[PDB]
């Protein structure tokens, strides 16, 4: 009571916050009336039990016609940052696997053998976790950055806004890159990494493989249109984006040749065996499948008439089923 | 009194490898005043007072 | 072409299995001896005769100047000038890709393991083709014992290039234990 | 007074002995430091018989290195040696035998001497060859090639049909 | 109920753990043998035995011995220390022998 | 560590750089709201 | 690009885990020397 | 009280000087089982848990 | 050192041998192989060479009879450039013969070449010319600690000689 | 390919093989140890500034009284371990002449290098025991410190310390060589050609080329 | 059923591992086994469905 409940409450209050409506709690936490009816537990459970798809549909319109928020943001795609951040790693070392070390390291040339080499360093700072805070940063930067001046635009727009903000945060990517096939642990850190690539190479050796960073980028951004459209070519879009894969991983051999990590330099990167290519394509659309980035900034008309009209069905579970038609209301 | 002279041995080293003939005192002396004078007081007052 | 022999005038110890570079040589005449034509070369009658030396027999190759843990060197070559080819070449290679997959799939279909032979008999022993020279060969399930070794020699290289000297952590481990212990003698 | 826990090794001990009492009798003549009065010089400080053994502490330890050979390590003589080196005066760096017994500055040598050993090994026998880990046999098998179907391969007319060689080139890619 | 229910099955976890050895070694003089072995969490516990004790049993009914894990290339020896009243069980792989 | 300074210099400039430009941009449309406010009431 | 699941390497493996506290079960079952009469 | 036997001594507390306890050549080892124990012991009380 | 604090410096030292040699635990045998194992054999009868040709199949052959009559410094420099490369077949194993003759060549071997990882020797009793040719060779190498010795019967298994040697040069082995 | 010449090249390396590299032969390779220093800095102000307000506030329990000097004594004796360990003369890289009586080698101190050539085979020595260090105390302009220094060493103006005191936070992971008139520390982990290098260190000088 | 027979088919026929049912060869179009296993995987269940729902 003096000792361990005091430490022992909070970690209790968090566990009910994440398994209870706090809005229902809430409301239910206030009894009474002051002269207005509809106050009562009854009328208050009535209520909540619609106020879970009001917020929904409140904080949906909130990231269309408010302002982007970051937290708001960040907790949408809370998965793909917070959970699965060793996913990108993974698919990273896949994608570059085929001018690394790893085949000499007790790892094959596939997605187990990335999953391997990745989960052999343990899962912090040196193993599942290493570049996980870089992926947070990069992802409050380009991505934010360019819903907070694409909100509410076109495809074109936002392709161009998001191509300019990728230019502009890129070294970031590149830094990440080299961690996260830095399965040595040569580099020490982000400045570490950044200062060493600066040393030995000039400050351009940081910005290989934008060009096709960027066109890559544009074929994701209309994949993720057509999905949040949910029109029927979604599917056709998938195969643009899986035939623009291989612009990925160029990009994520070049940034990770010319450096000790690498047994490649940037002249034979480009030719390089054709057939690995398409290195971890399928793990890479799995993962996007499963984790589309949710942008609800750059939804679409189509794609703001299909939330609502799911909310809406829902909605409409609250009538009485055997309810009377009677002549007079 | 190990650290001084380590101090000196290493600045003693230096100087002469660079040829500078001046010996780095501000490194060999970082807080020798400081410690001896904590210490000695701290000494003074347990004698006092036990 | 499949027979050959070859005489070595005591240069070459045929009681142990010959070095891969003494194979290496031996397919590097062959190759020769097939494609320039054949004089009747290689018979037990008339076989072919090689001195080799011990630096032939032994020595692996030069040009050893790799530079350990480099980096590619920058802002000679212009970078924000030959960006654009570089661009374009990735271009062509993806646009590439699927047509490449498509031709190498027809050419496995018109195509057949058996076509080529990669066996050849020498001083009355099998050998198979092996990267740049040749192989015993003795049996299917020794073949491929001897590709299970070579991959895992291959796979676990790094592994077993561990730092020896890397015992910081151990001796402070050490250190610590002994001077609790010579604090207890004390 | 006496447990039932496995004693060191001590097959080295006598040669550190050996070594280090030559040594220090190059330098203390009439210390009368022989291999035959080790169980009765392990009882005794150093300062009892006038040796200071701070000074020739680091010199002991070179000879040594140089001197014994292990076979138990699963590192050749000459890494073994050097680490062996680098390990020890690290470690006596910052102990002071001279208060202390003989025993226990071999004891103590004879103890890096044998974990220093063990971790050559991994901690594990060298005589013993153990099984695989499961990393170890799931790499073997991934490793193993496939041999595929060898009807399709056969020479034969009906494998030059347009169905059999696409299942050729389906199964034996 | 909660502190002897997690005492018991603790206590008797351990109990069928102990049986097995996780490393054996002879003395100098191959005199004696100790047997490492599980403990309680999982880490090592050192015992003693003696090699004249150590002996290999068979069963008491007669008709059980084709039902031992010996019988196996890959089964489990079971030894048994007179002496102790104890259970020593070896993998019968020659991996695990030296 | 001078490349190391050099990097960190580098990069604090060019976020601050932008931050620069966004509330810049930002003032610039407060302003003209609340111009547009004022007139309004 | 090395091949990774195949479907006969999984059920060997799905054999061996089955087959492998068959050791252990029959150890336990088995008599032993005592009889406790 | 029941240590003090009548006609038998009871074994001495230490073992006998002629015993060496020098360690000597491993025969058998199988670190995994360790390792198998720890997986087992912590399932169980998570599950039992 | 001390038998209470064993246990505790046993888990320590466990716990950081993983820094310099991650997951030692489940990769251990197959760190029992080194780099580049240079192997050093003594035996010339017939089953010493059937065993030698089995169990080094993948190894490539250095025959050291060829340097007689040549200095010590320069015999050990010229083995060394010989075991101290990897051919485009990535064979990273050679196995020396008929060498060395003496504890001066055996000795320099193994400074230039950091030593011989293993030192194979096969007792055949139908063998009269190894030992009086590397004799000295063979004490060398039992000093250094190197050497292993698996005696061979001309009339035992094959099979099973094979597969005991097999064991006790991986056991043998060194980095 | 690459990965075999990349191995061929650490291999070599590992051996101290190299070739002849112009005018010069490389025989050895070591570097030096990197300690932190900034982080113990940092949190010795942090805890002496910490211990400053709650001293002022009062409003700090006893337990954060304790626990803070002595973290803050903590750190402070590490930086100055750390600071001492960093400033070591470490031995990085030695090179031969063809003649084979010259040698010149480059020195770290605190990570930063530092050449020095013409250097005598003749002059090197590797002291394999605890050598002495002499300290002159007329060169201390501080009158404490060398009364200090005096009263410890209990000796003269010129005192002499044997090194093994010193080996604690002097060479601790290597040996001590005289590079002439200077001294140098040589790190146990190096790559070297030891053939050359035993002879070099014990004074003998190898035969040209 | 179709995608996991044709999935194991295909497994173990590429570790070398083929059902011996229905002839090696056919008797007109000499279509291989495996090609006529995959026909007869794809089509039977389909036929089964069929009479079994009617
Ligand atoms: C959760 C509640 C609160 C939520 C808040 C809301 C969320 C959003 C908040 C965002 C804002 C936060 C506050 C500000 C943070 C600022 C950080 C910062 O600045 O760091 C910088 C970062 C720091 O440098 P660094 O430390 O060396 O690099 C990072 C290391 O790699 C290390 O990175 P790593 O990825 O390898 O790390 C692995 C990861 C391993 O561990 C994990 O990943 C664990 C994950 C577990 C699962 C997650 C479960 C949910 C979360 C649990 C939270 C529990 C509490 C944790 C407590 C942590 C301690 C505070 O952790 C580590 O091991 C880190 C190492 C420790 C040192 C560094 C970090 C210190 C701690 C700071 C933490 C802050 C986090 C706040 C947000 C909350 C995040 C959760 O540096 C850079 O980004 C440098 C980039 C340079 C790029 C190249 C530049 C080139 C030149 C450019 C030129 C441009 C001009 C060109 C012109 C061209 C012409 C036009
Ligand atoms: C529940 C079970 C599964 C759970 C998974 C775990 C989930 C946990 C939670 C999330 C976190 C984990 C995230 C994922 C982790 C990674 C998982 C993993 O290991 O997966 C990799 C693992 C393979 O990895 P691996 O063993 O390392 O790869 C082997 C080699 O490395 C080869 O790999 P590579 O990287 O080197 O790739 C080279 C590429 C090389 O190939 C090429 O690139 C070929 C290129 C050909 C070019 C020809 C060009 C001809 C000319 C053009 C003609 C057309 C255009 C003409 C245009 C004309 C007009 C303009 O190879 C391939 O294409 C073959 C890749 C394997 C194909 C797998 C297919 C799975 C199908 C599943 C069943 C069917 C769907 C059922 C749907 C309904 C289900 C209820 O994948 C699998 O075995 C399957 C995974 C599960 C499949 C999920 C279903 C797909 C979902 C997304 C796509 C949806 C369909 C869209 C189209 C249809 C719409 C109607
Ligand atoms: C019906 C409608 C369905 C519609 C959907 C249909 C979709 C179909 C998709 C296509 C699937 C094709 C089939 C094959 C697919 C195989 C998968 C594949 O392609 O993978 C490629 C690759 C293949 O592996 P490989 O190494 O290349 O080669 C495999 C060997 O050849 C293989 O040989 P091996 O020797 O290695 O054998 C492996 C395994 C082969 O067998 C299997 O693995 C098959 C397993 C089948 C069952 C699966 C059920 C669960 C499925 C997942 C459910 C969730 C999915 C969610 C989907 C997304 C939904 C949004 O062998 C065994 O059988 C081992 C024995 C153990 C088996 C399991 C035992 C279960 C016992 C249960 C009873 C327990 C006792 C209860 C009673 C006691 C009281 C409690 O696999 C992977 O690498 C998979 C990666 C998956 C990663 C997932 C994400 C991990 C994220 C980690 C995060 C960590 C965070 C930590 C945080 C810490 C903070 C402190
Ligand atoms: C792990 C906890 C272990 C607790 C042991 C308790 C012993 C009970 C014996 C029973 C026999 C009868 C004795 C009389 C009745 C006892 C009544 C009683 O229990 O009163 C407790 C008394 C009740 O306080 P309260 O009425 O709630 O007042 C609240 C104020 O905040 C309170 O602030 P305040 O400044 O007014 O506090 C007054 C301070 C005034 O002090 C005194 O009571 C008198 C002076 C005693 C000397 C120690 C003072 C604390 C200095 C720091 C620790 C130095 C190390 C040596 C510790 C020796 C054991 C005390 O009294 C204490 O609290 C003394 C204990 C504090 C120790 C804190 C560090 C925990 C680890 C300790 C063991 C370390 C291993 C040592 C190995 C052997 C070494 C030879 O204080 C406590 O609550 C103590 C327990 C607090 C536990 C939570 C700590 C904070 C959260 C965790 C932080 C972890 C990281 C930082 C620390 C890391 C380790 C250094
Ligand atoms: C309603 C339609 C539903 C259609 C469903 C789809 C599947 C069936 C049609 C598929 C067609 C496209 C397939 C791809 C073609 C690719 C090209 C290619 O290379 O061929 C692939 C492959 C043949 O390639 P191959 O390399 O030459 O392989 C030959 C191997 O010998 C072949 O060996 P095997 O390994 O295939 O094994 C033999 C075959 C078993 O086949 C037999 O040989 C069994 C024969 C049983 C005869 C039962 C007595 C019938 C009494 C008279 C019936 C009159 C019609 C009544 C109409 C009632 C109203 C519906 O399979 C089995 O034994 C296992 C299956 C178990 C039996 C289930 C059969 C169900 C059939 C359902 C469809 C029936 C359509 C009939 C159309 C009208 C016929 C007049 O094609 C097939 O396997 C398809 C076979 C379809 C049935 C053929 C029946 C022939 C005997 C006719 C007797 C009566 C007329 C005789 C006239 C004589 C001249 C004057
Ligand atoms: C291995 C260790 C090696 C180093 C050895 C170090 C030797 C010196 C040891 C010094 C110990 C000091 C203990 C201080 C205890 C806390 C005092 C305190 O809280 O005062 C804050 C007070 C009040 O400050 P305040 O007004 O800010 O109040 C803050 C209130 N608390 C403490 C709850 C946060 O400040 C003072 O003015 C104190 C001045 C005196 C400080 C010394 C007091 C010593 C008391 C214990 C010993 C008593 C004598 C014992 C018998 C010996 C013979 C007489």
């Known amino acids: 009571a003096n000792f361990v409940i005091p430490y022992l409450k909070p970690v209790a209050d968090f566990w009910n916050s994440l398994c209870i409506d706090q809005h229902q709690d809430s409301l239910f936490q206030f009894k009474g009336q002051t002269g207005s009816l509809g106050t009562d537990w009854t009328s208050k459970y009535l209520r909540s039990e619609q106020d879970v798809y009001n917020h929904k549909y409140l904080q949906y319109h909130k990231r269309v016609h408010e302002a982007p928020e970051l937290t708001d943001v960040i907790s949408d795609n809370v998965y793909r940052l917070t959970l699965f951040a060793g996913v990108e790693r993974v698919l990273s070392v896949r994608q570059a696997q085929a001018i690394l070390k790893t085949q000499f390291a007790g790892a094959t040339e596939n997605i187990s053998g990335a999953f391997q080499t990745v989960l052999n360093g343990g899962i912090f700072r040196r193993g599942y976790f290493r570049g996980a805070l870089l992926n947070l940063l990069q992802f409050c930067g380009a991505p934010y950055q360019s819903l907070i001046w694409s909100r509410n635009s076109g495809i074109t727009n936002q392709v161009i806004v998001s191509s300019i903000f990728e230019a502009f945060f890129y070294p970031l990517d590149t830094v990440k890159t080299l961690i996260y096939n830095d399965v040595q642990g040569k580099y020490k850190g982000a400045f570490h990494c950044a200062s060493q690539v600066v040393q030995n190479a000039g400050w351009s050796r940081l910005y290989a493989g934008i060009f096709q960073k960027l066109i890559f980028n544009s074929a994701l951004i209309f994949h993720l249109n057509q999905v949040w459209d949910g029109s029927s070519q979604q599917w056709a879009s998938l195969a643009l984006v899986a035939a623009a894969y291989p612009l990925l991983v160029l990009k994520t051999r070049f940034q990770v040749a010319g450096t000790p990590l690498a047994l490649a330099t940037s002249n034979e990167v480009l030719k390089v065996n054709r057939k690995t290519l398409y290195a971890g394509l399928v793990p890479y659309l799995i993962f996007n499948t499963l984790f589309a980035y949710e942008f609800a900034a750059w939804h679409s008309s189509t794609a703001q008439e299909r939330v609502i009209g799911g909310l809406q069905n829902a909605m409409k579970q609250f009538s009485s089923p055997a309810a009377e038609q009677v002549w007079s209301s | 009194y190990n650290h001084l002279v380590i101090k000196y041995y290493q600045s003693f080293i230096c100087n002469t490898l660079i040829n500078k003939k001046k010996l780095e005192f501000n490194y060999i002396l970082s807080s020798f005043k400081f410690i001896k004078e904590l210490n000695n007081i701290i000494i003074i007052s347990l004698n006092k007072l036990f | 072409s499949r027979i050959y022999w070859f005489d070595f005038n005591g240069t070459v110890n045929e009681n142990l299995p010959l070095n891969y570079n003494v194979l290496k040589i031996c397919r590097n005449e062959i190759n020769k001896l097939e494609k320039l034509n054949e004089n009747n070369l290689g018979t037990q009658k008339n076989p072919i005769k090689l001195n080799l030396s011990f630096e032939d027999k032994h020595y692996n190759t030069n040009n050893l100047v790799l530079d350990l843990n480099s980096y590619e060197t920058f802002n000679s070559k212009n970078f924000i000038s030959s960006i654009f080819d570089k661009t374009f070449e990735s271009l062509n290679t993806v646009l590439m890709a699927p047509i490449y997959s498509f031709l190498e799939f027809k050419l496995k279909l018109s195509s057949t393991k058996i076509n080529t032979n990669h066996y050849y008999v020498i001083n009355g022993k099998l050998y198979i083709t092996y990267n740049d020279s040749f192989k015993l060969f003795t049996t299917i399930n020794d073949y491929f014992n001897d590709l299970n070794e070579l991959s895992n020699t291959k796979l676990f290289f790094l592994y077993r290039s561990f730092n020896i000297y890397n015992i910081k952590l151990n001796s402070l481990v050490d250190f610590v234990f002994l001077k609790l212990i010579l604090f207890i003698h004390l | 007074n006496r447990t039932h826990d496995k004693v060191i090794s001590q097959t080295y001990v006598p040669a550190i002995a050996n070594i280090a009492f030559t040594h220090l009798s190059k330098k203390y003549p009439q210390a009368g430091l022989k291999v035959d009065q080790l169980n009765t010089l392990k009882e005794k400080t150093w300062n009892d018989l006038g040796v200071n053994i701070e000074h020739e502490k680091q010199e002991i330890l070179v000879e040594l290195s140089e001197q014994i050979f292990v076979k138990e390590s699963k590192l050749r003589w000459v890494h073994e040696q050097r680490q062996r080196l680098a390990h020890t005066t690290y470690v006596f760096s910052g102990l002071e035998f001279q208060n202390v017994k003989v025993g226990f500055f071999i004891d103590s040598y004879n103890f890096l001497l044998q974990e220093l050993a063990h971790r050559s090994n991994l901690y594990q026998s060298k005589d013993i060859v153990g099984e695989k880990s499961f990393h170890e046999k799931h790499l073997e098998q991934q490793t193993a090639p496939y041999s595929g179907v060898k009807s399709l391969e056969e020479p034969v007319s009906q494998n030059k049909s347009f169905i059999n060689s696409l299942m050729r080139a389906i199964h034996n890619h | ?98 | 560590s001078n490349v190391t300074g050099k990097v960190a210099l580098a990069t604090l400039g060019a976020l601050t750089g932008y931050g620069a430009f966004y509330h810049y941009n930002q003032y610039l449309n407060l302003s003209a709201r609340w111009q547009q406010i004022q007139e309004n009431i | 690009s090395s091949k990774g699941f195949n479907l006969a390497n999984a059920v060997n493996t799905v054999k061996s885990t089955l087959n492998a506290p068959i050791k252990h079960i029959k150890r336990n079952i088995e008599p032993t020397g005592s009889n406790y009469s | 009280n029941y240590l003090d036997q009548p006609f038998v001594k009871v074994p001495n507390a230490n073992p006998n000087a002629s015993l060496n306890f020098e360690e000597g050549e491993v025969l058998y080892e199988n670190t995994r089982l360790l390792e198998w124990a720890k997986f087992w012991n912590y399932s169980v009380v998570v599950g039992y848990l | 050192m001390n038998n209470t604090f064993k246990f505790l410096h046993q888990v320590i030292s466990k716990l950081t041998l993983k820094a310099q040699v991650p997951n030692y635990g489940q990769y251990s045998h197959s760190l029992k192989r080194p780099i580049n194992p240079k192997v050093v054999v003594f035996g010339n009868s017939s089953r010493a060479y059937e065993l030698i040709s089995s169990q080094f199949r993948n190894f490539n052959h250095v025959n050291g009879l060829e340097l007689k009559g040549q200095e010590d410094n320069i015999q050990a420099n010229k083995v060394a450039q010989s075991v101290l490369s990897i051919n485009d077949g990535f064979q990273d194993g050679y196995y020396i013969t008929d060498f060395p003759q003496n504890s001066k060549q055996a000795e320099r071997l193994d400074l230039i070449t950091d030593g011989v990882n293993l030192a194979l020797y096969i007792k055949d009793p139908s063998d009269k010319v190894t030992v009086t040719r590397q004799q000295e060779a063979i004490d060398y190498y039992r000093k250094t600690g190197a050497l292993v010795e698996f005696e061979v019967d001309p009339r035992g298994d094959l099979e099973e000689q094979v597969k005991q040697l097999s064991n006790q040069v991986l056991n043998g082995y060194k980095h | 390919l690459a990965f075999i010449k990349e191995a061929n090249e650490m291999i070599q390396q590992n051996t101290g093989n190299l070739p002849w590299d112009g005018g010069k032969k490389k025989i050895f390779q070591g570097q030096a140890n990197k300690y932190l220093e900034t982080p113990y800095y940092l949190l010795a102000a942090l805890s002496g500034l910490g211990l400053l307000y709650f001293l002022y506030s009062g409003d700090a329990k006893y337990k954060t009284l304790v626990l803070t000097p002595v973290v803050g004594i903590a750190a402070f004796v590490l930086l100055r371990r750390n600071q001492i360990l960093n400033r070591v003369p470490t031995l990085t890289e030695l090179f031969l002449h063809k003649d084979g009586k010259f040698v010149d080698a480059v020195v770290s101190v605190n990570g930063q290098l530092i050449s020095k050539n013409d250097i005598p085979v003749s002059t090197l020595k590797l002291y394999r025991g605890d050598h002495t260090v002499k300290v002159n105390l007329n060169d201390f302009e501080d009158a404490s410190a060398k009364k200090f220094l005096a009263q410890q060493s209990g000796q003269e103006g010129v005192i002499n310390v044997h090194f093994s005191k010193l080996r604690n936070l002097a060479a601790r992971n290597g040996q001590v060589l005289n590079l002439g008139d200077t001294e140098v520390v040589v790190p146990f982990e190096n790559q070297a050609n030891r053939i050359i290098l035993k002879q070099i260190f014990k004074g003998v000088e190898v035969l040209p080329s | 059923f179709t995608a996991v027979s044709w999935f194991s088919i295909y497994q173990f026929a590429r570790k070398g591992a083929v059902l011996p049912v229905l002839r090696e060869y056919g008797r007109y179009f000499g279509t291989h086994r495996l090609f006529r296993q995959y026909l007869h995987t794809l089509v039977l269940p389909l036929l089964y469905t069929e009479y079994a729902l009617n």
């Open chain 5, 1 to 98: 109920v909660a502190i002897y229910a997690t005492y018991i099955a603790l206590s008797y976890i351990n109990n069928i753990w102990k049986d097995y050895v996780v490393r054996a070694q002879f003395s100098k003089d191959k005199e004696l043998l100790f047997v490492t072995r599980v403990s309680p969490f999982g880490t090592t516990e050192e015992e003693v035995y003696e090699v004249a004790h150590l002996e290999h049993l068979p069963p008491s009914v007669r008709s059980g011995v084709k039902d031992l894990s010996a019988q196996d290339a890959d089964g489990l020896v079971d030894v048994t220390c007179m002496s102790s009243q104890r259970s020593l069980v070896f993998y019968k792989g020659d991996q695990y022998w030296n």
